[model samples]
Target: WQEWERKVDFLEENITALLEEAQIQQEKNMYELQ
Candidate 1:
């Protein structure tokens, strides 16, 4: 059970990081268009 929880936490961290990176890229694209 502890192992499963750890896996979930790791996945959540990676997902959050990906979302932040995607947001940054989106902002960059908007600036380029402007």
Candidate 2:
């Protein structure tokens, strides 16, 4: 159970990081299009 919780936390953190990165990429794309 402890290891399972650790994996979940790791995934959540990675997902948050990915979402923030995706937002940055979208912003960059808009600038490029403009």
lDDT by residue (tens digit), candidate 2, 1-34: 9999999999999999999999999999999999
How well does each candidate superpose onto the true structure, as a TM-score? Answer: 0.73, 0.82
Least lDDT summed over 10 consecutive residues: which range in candidate 2? 25-34
Q: List the residue pairs that clash in candidate 2.
A: none
Q: In candidate 1, what are the lDDT values of residues 1-34, reduced to their tens digit?
A: 9999999999999999999999999999999999
Candidate 2 local lDDT, residue 18: 99
List, in order, the clash count of every candidate structure.
Answer: 0, 0
TM-score of 1: 0.73
Top lDDT prediction, candidate number: 2
TM-score of 2: 0.82
